[PDB]
Design a protein around this ligand. Structure first.
Ligand SMILES: CO[C@H]1O[C@H](CO)[C@@H](O)[C@H](O)[C@@H]1O[C@H]1O[C@H](CO)[C@@H](O)[C@H](O)[C@@H]1O
Ligand SMILES: CO[C@H]1O[C@H](CO)[C@@H](O)[C@H](O)[C@@H]1O[C@H]1O[C@H](CO)[C@@H](O)[C@H](O)[C@@H]1O
Ligand SMILES: [Ca+2]
Ligand SMILES: [Ca+2]
Ligand SMILES: [Mn+2]
Ligand SMILES: [Mn+2]
Lengths: 240, 240
């Protein structure tokens, strides 16, 4: 289909079109990307992702068309620790994408350690909300919580300072305009605090024509819950 | 998802979210539901159906919601004969639905011979465009070409006289309003010739909460191509 869209105002446990990977599972009408104990408390060493089952037609070689897509979603992180980790990410990858071996912790369940920074070894575009930046383990991160745009590497091609607010929902709008090739990210907290980051990227050179969209999150030694509360997505092929 | 929509202005051969059953396949950016030979002519004894991969949330028992859906599509029928058979049908059925054994010909690939008219043995709502009505083989049909609304039976609960035009595309709009429970069908040829048929049906008592939508076509001894040219679909769960 040239156009596809779906909306999850909430996530009832009765799901049919979501591909759950790792520890990801539905709880309290929300997606708990990372594992939590019987008390709903976050635990260490956990990775989880969800993908919408239907493949998205990102671009079409034959018609020279590229998709105009928008992904609106909200999530919240919670942790009794002063340094909750590791972060959540909205990502776009090949349809057969699975959790890479050893992709936990700072790699957000998106990259394998050996090629995490090899842009030629990956095919993924992701908007990460990174809360752990310990300069000894996450050597690639700026020294502070941030929102980053990842293109075939865990080393964001771009980051903007971000504030982590325990238990507060962040509303995020990620849009891609094929005309300008601008990938825009706008995130806001309920008090009006706003964060914006944009990047020009030709998705045609990074991802295959058909892809799957979803979220990923992980916790290494430090942990926190990564709760996806809602998600709406829409894409439509346009001439360029 | 509470809401889902997809649109196929045409049907390129590189499909990822379509379940093809029987003889259905893509040809010339269109879906040929029934089998055709090398030179593109319709053949006898052929059944074919397609279903969108993503399951549709037709209704939700917990929230007492029923989806409002709209299915817009166009098709054309071509046949060297002028007794082309048997017709095409838009249908909604449980997710695991498959072509019933012996559902060819007048059964449109939707029902099994032994239960074709047993309403309690089926789970399917279809909008058929029936071109073959020989009373000896299709004993359940009115004696003329017709558009029918099928609810768990090949014997339409409601029909309207229809005109088969060889090679001409029929534009169809199928809508279900959960508020009034009316399933409305509007079909028009490019020249404005219009056909309407509607029926009140509580989809909750007929279909499970999650379903799959698609098309089915078949030709018995009489044949014709059943060419699905375009299809857009959208459903949104609503409170009433
Ligand atoms: C101390 O470093 C680990 O934890 C931090 C914070 O969670 C991560 O950012 C970092 O990637 C490290 O996690 C790795 O090591 C963990 C312990 O072996 C393991 O559980 C993780 O999956 C990851 O490999
Ligand atoms: C006896 O009529 C056959 O053809 C008409 C017109 O195509 C159908 O409406 C009717 O169902 C009959 O088709 C059946 O028999 C065919 C030959 O045995 C078979 O190919 C069909 O699948 C169907 O069973
Ligand atoms: Ca990090
Ligand atoms: Ca018939
Ligand atoms: Mn980072
Ligand atoms: Mn009929």
């Amino acid at each position: 289909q040239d156009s596809l869209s779906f909306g999850f105002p909430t996530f009832p446990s009765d799901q049919k079109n979501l591909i759950f990977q790792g520890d990801a599972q539905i709880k309290n009408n929300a997606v708990q990307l990372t594992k939590t104990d019987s008390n709903g408390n976050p635990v260490a060493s956990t990775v989880g992702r969800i993908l919408f089952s239907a493949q998205v037609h990102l671009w079409e070689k034959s018609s020279s068309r590229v998709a105009n897509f928008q992904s609106q979603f909200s999530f919240s992180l919670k942790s009794p620790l002063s340094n909750g980790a590791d972060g959540i990410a909205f990502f776009i990858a090949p349809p057969d994408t699975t959790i890479p071996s050893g992709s936990g912790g700072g790699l957000l369940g998106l990259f394998a350690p050996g090629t995490a920074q090899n842009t030629s070894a990956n095919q993924v575009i992701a908007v990460e909300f990174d809360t752990f930046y310990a300069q000894d383990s996450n050597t690639w991160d700026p020294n502070y919580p941030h929102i980053g745009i990842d293109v075939n590497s865990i080393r964001s091609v771009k980051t903007v300072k971000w504030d982590r607010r325990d238990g507060q929902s962040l509303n995020v709008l990620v849009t891609f305009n094929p005309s300008t090739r601008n990938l825009d990210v706008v995130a806001t907290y309920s008090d009006g605090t706003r964060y914006e980051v944009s990047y020009e990227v030709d998705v045609r050179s990074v991802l295959p024509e058909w892809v799957r969209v979803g979220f990923s999150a992980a916790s290494g030694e430090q942990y926190q819950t990564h709760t996806l509360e809602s998600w709406s997505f829409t894409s439509t092929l346009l001439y360029t």
